[PDB]
Design a protein around this ligand. Structure first.
Ligand SMILES: CC(=O)N[C@@H]1[C@@H](O)[C@H](O)[C@@H](CO)O[C@H]1O
Ligand SMILES: CC(=O)N[C@@H]1[C@@H](O)[C@H](O)[C@@H](CO)O[C@H]1O
Ligand SMILES: *[C@@H]1O[C@H](CO)[C@@H](O)[C@H](O)[C@H]1NC(C)=O
Lengths: 50, 50, 89
């Protein structure tokens, strides 16, 4: 029995992932963040929660 | 006369992982099924339901 | 007096929030700042944990608190209680 109310969902299906393609123009979705462009290795240092 | 744009080829979809996978053993594998007079209820939350 | 909920909506277990102990044998007491927020369906906690030499009032220095947890708990938070010579909070 499934319900939808207003509270954030806590039960969900698996989120299928693909491999990672670098140095090419691609479409992407990183944990819900979408866009297009070319991915390269960064020299930026993100904090553990960013 | 016109503009050009490099088009994307592949697509990248990436999610953290599959964790807290919902067992469902408590309802499909458990041997001690209750009868209709006292059917059991198991609550599912904070999990991945495949 | 009582010790039974007979329920469970959500449960989370991780590393202790308060028990970060270092810099003993000195005046460096660990000031443990927390920020608690209740937003649409989520309860957020931020914290830092910074040792200070002056223990009487806030140090008047500057730092930002980092995200600690973010729990999908859709409940009514209107009141709260702190559970605990006597520096207090
Ligand atoms: C209710 C239940 O879990 N039944 C499991 C099934 O899911 C699993 O795939 C199989 C081994 O392949 O063994 C059965 O006992
Ligand atoms: C013993 C007890 O209080 N059980 C309560 C039930 O009365 C309430 O209707 C339900 C709402 O989800 O939550 C249960 O934990
Ligand atoms: C409980 O929350 C609802 C909306 O979420 C609000 O209208 C109601 O006043 C709250 N109850 C109390 C005691 O504050």
């Amino acid at each position: 029995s499934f319900e939808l109310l207003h509270a954030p969902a806590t039960v969900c299906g698996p989120k299928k992932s693909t491999n990672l393609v670098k140095n090419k123009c691609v479409n992407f979705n990183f944990n819900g963040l979408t866009g297009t462009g070319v991915l390269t290795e960064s020299n930026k240092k993100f904090l553990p929660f960013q | 006369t016109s503009n050009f744009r490099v088009q994307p080829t592949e697509s990248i979809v990436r999610f953290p992982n599959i964790t807290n996978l919902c067992p469902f053993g408590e309802v499909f594998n458990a041997t001690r099924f209750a009868s209709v007079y006292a059917w059991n209820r198991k609550r599912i939350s904070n999990c991945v339901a495949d | 007096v009582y010790s039974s909920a007979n329920n469970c909506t959500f449960e989370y277990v991780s590393q202790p929030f308060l028990m970060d102990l270092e810099g003993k044998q000195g005046n460096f007491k660990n000031l443990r700042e927390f920020v608690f927020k209740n937003i649409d369906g989520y309860f957020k906690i931020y914290s830092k944990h910074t040792p200070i030499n002056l223990v009487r009032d806030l140090p008047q220095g500057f730092s930002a608190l980092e995200p600690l947890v973010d729990l999908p708990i859709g409940i009514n938070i209107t009141r709260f209680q702190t559970l605990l010579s006597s520096s207090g909070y």
